Design a protein around this nucleic acid. Structure first.
Ligand SMILES: [Hg+2]
Ligand SMILES: [Hg+2]
Ligand SMILES: [Hg+2]
Length: 649
DNA sequence: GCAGTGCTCGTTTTTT
DNA sequence: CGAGCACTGC
């Protein structure tokens, strides 16, 4: 019903939800409710323009997002609403490559490569090419190769004109691929490019999709890279009508491939594409939006817009100058204690910082105050070492040619397959262009390895073959439990020293549970299905989930969240903005955008703080306040301070 | 391979 | 300043 979908929505949201089928850019301000627009828009396309759920493809970047969206779509709607592709670039890209793996030149069960895996593979290849890992860093190689793919550039496209400095990397890249392709491996970047290329080379397939997906919605468009923009464009073609939602002002992932352009490029490569601006904010108080507005104007790129609210101005924005970094912490904690002692929840308080560096000091301060908290730093579940070791065994069960999985657990736990043995193996793979496993088979046959070692290498191969069979007809969480024991991993981590050893076992226990609860769906078998899941869904950092805890994280990982109380620390020049943005650049505007984001995360109160002194790795330093703090209105601001009042008793 | 030891130098930053 | 970490001698 037309009113069912438009009544709760505001004037300009309706504009977006009810516009005619076409290409349009919905420029979503900060607390404007863009998701609500995306959800309502989709239900509108189905109910009003009467489109088939199979004609809709909403794409996001994070899984959290994909889920929130898949969830909300359901409740506004009747039921499941299947037939509708909702997911992330990588996720949807992965989906296509499975459905058309053969036409994509990929094997049945190709496996995905997470950062680590990829990083290690480069290291092995750089060495096996006799290159100085000291002056040819894998980390560097990685950046080169990922950056290359985010442009659709394969090795035979690199135009290294004369500097071997580049002609060399191309070499690495060429080997990396040759290897990956030989083992059935695909990294994140590959997923998009292979998909893209897939449409380029197979007209009928591309045709089949242009025919199905006529309604495309893309969120966070300001964070797309060149190949994603391209992938969308190619799919929309001439028929598809795409709605892109974005904020050219919250783009803060440029240092990894995000194109500030794309949001405008859309407008250019799309005449007729109108632009609906959502500027009513239902998040913050008027002062916050004021300061927010003010700040962001200082940047020049911008497509323009002013966040406004119907709510009261609210409390002013508190600024604080602390002695040193350790005082700044106590300040934040005491404001929070007050919050709490007045009935405030801890989980409604967030302390934001620019660098992970800044968390240490904050925690002790919180801990000392016996104040519960949660940090959102790193180490996802499917990235912990005990988990990857386990997965690499399952990985070997699916495909013996998974060099990455082989290299990882062949001698993990130690089973006597040393370096002199593995050195021979890794070289044979190069010279006879074979996958590690293949090479171990010919060498064994040829008896080219030292008897005792060879005997060990053998026993290994037999173990994997034995598990690949014995475990064929078992439930996923049974096969997992068996592999975790037979691999010898449990025994290894069982006897690992103290607290850490404990933690690693409790996680292997969690891996089985995750497998148990793993809900099927479909296209592939559970083990592969599950491996794909673990590679694409990092999966958080465990329990301690019920406690009312204060929220700590970097500004980057606060994007999209909102808290009544938001504390931003380290607001000083030399830290925010810092190095790069100082000695000449322009990443500065990105830094002010990051700032802008932080500011627009506050609902009731914002407290910015900085110190006159902090011990920046090494000596004491004396930073002055971020220019950002000075770019906020004087009326919306309120400076707090402690003064030495010596009263003669 | 692994336990210790001597030496970096600080990536702003996190997704998949 | 120290977490992380390339180096050997067993
Ligand atoms: Hg339609
Ligand atoms: Hg001060
Ligand atoms: Hg104000």
């Amino acid at each position: 019903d037309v009113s069912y979908l438009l009544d709760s929505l505001n004037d300009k949201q309706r504009e977006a939800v009810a516009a005619p089928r076409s290409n349009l850019l919905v420029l979503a301000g900060a607390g404007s409710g863009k998701t609500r627009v995306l959800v309502h828009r989709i239900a509108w396309l189905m109910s009003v323009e009467n489109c088939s759920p199979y004609s809709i493809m909403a794409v996001t970047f994070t899984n959290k997002a994909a889920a929130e969206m898949r969830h909300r779509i359901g409740q506004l709607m009747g039921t499941s609403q299947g037939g509708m592709w909702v997911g992330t670039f990588h996720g949807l890209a992965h989906r296509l490559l499975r459905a058309h793996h053969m036409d994509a030149n990929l094997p049945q069960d190709f496996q995905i490569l997470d950062s680590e895996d990829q990083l290690r593979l480069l290291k092995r290849l750089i060495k096996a090419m006799n290159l100085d890992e000291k002056q040819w860093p894998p980390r560097q190689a990685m950046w080169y190769i990922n950056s290359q793919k985010d442009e659709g550039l394969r090795p035979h496209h690199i135009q290294s004109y004369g500097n071997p400095v580049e002609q060399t990397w191309q070499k690495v890249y060429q080997a990396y691929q040759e290897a990956c392709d030989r083992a059935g491996l695909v990294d994140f970047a590959e997923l998009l490019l292979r998909a893209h290329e897939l449409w380029l080379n197979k007209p009928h397939i591309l045709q089949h999709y242009r025919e199905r997906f006529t309604n495309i919605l893309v969120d966070e468009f300001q964070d797309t890279n060149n190949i994603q923009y391209a992938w969308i464009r190619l799919l929309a073609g001439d028929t598809g009508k795409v709605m892109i939602v974005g904020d050219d002002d919250q783009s803060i992932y440029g240092w990894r491939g995000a194109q500030v352009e794309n949001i405008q490029r859309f407008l250019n490569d799309f005449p007729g594409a109108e632009t609906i601006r959502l500027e009513q904010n239902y998040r913050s108080t008027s002062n916050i939006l004021s300061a927010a507005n003010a700040l962001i104007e200082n940047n020049n790129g911008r497509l323009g817009k002013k966040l406004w609210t119907d709510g009261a101005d609210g409390e002013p924005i508190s600024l604080y100058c602390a002695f040193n970094e350790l005082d700044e912490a106590r300040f934040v904690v005491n404001r929070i204690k007050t919050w709490q002692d007045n009935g405030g929840a801890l989980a409604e308080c967030a302390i934001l910082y620019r660098s992970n560096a800044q968390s240490r000091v904050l925690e002790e301060a919180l801990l000392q105050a016996s104040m519960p908290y949660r940090i959102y730093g790193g180490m996802r579940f499917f990235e912990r070492q005990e988990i990857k070791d386990a997965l690499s065994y399952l990985r070997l069960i699916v495909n013996r040619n998974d060099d990455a999985a082989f290299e990882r657990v062949v001698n993990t736990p130690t089973r006597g397959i040393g370096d002199r043995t593995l050195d021979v193996v890794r070289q044979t793979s190069r010279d006879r262009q074979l996958t590690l496993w293949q090479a171990c088979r010919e060498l064994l046959q040829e008896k080219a390895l030292a008897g005792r070692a060879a005997s060990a290498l053998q026993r290994f191969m037999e173990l994997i073959d034995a598990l690949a069979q014995e475990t064929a007809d078992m439930p996923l969480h049974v096969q997992t439990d068996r592999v975790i024991k037979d691999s010898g991993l449990r025994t290894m981590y069982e006897q690992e020293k103290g607290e850490k050893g404990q933690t690693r076992i409790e996680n292997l226990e969690e891996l089985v549970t995750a497998t148990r609860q793993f809900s099927y769906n479909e296209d592939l078998m559970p083990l592969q299905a599950f491996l794909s899941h673990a590679a694409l869904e990092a999966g958080e950092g465990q329990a301690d989930t019920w406690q009312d805890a204060v929220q700590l994280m970097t500004l980057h990982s606060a994007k999209g969240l909102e808290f009544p109380q938001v504390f931003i620390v380290g607001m000083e020049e030399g830290m925010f903005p810092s190095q790069m943005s100082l000695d000449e650049g322009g990443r500065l505007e990105e830094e002010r955008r990051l700032a802008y984001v932080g500011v627009t995360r506050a609902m009731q109160k914002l407290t910015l703080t900085y110190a006159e002194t902090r011990r920046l790795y090494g000596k004491e330093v004396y930073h002055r306040p971020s220019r950002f703090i000075g770019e906020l209105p004087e009326e919306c601001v309120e400076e707090v301070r402690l003064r030495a009042t010596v009263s003669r008793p």
